[PDB]
Design an enzyme around this catalytic site. Sequence first.
Site, mmCIF file in Angstrom:
data_model
loop_
_atom_site.group_PDB
_atom_site.id
_atom_site.type_symbol
_atom_site.label_atom_id
_atom_site.label_comp_id
_atom_site.label_asym_id
_atom_site.label_seq_id
_atom_site.Cartn_x
_atom_site.Cartn_y
_atom_site.Cartn_z
ATOM 1 N N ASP A 35 0.826 -1.204 0.000
ATOM 2 C CA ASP A 35 0.000 0.000 0.000
ATOM 3 C C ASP A 35 0.865 1.261 0.000
ATOM 4 O OD1 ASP A 35 -1.937 1.903 0.324
ATOM 5 O OD2 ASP A 35 -2.399 1.394 2.427
ATOM 6 N N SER A 199 -0.841 15.564 -12.045
ATOM 7 C CA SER A 199 -1.097 15.210 -13.425
ATOM 8 C C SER A 199 -1.360 16.466 -14.230
ATOM 9 C CB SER A 199 -2.301 14.269 -13.492
ATOM 10 O OG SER A 199 -2.710 14.006 -14.816
#
Length: 330
Positions: A35, A199
Amino acid sequence: STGSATTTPIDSLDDAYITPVQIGTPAQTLNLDFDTGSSDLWVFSSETTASEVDGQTIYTPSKSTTAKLLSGATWSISYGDGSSSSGDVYTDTVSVGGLTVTGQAVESAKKVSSSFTEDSTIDGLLGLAFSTLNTVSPTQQKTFFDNAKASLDSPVFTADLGYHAPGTYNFGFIDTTAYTGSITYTAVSTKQGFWEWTSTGYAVGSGTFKSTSIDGIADTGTTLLYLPATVVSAYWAQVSGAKSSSSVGGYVFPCSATLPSFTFGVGSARIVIPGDYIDFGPISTGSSSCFGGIQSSAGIGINIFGDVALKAAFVVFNGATTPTLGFASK
């Protein structure tokens, strides 16, 4: 040194991925959920409340000759999905894919929440976010990666998650045969303890690319792709019959649909998520309403590039003095 381990979807939907991890001496092999959105290595154990164990493999520290109780240390964690676990702490030898760390903090669960009990395939989590998020008290502990880093050939690990197929976690090297083209690196902020990056935009299907900054985290421990409501609405508007259902808890779509792809930007590069990656199947057995793999982050407070996004790429988690993230197509 290096390590390399195969990671395997837990079910037919790629709801999560499990990677075998050797703990203790002799080795006890547990299948952990790696994770990159948390920083605790915790396991089902011989100390876990018996009614809360249902099929998991447990770590028994009393059977490990290298286990030592970390005196006074406790841990307690809550995840974004509302699940939780807590317990005490041992140090022990932990190996992943041939890479060994001695003195790793292994957090032994005394209590786990129902979602963990109900998932027989996940024996615990191995956190790969920054150690500043580790919950051990009163002395915070380091992640497996943080402990291994100085010994690694290069201070990196990579995630290569498969679509309905196994994939690979590598530590200490970049497998240049595992991706196509080049890896585009992008800046990371560690201020919230995550692999947080921005992004450069998105496209829906064959549509034009929208240049827009989307801050979010690369999180292998989250199944879906969670993005701003504007972006998610633009995606689902291209699927006839798709709608947001408050009763179901997100966007659903007719299972008869063909889903468009979704592209996200990494600098000037583009990662394309095929439409099929966005199908999470019937909302309940036999239903013709299917659950979407792109959902709104509104009210999460952060955008999350979970498995839906990451599995479309070869992803480098570069733990150099100034960390960065790399993405390549594959």
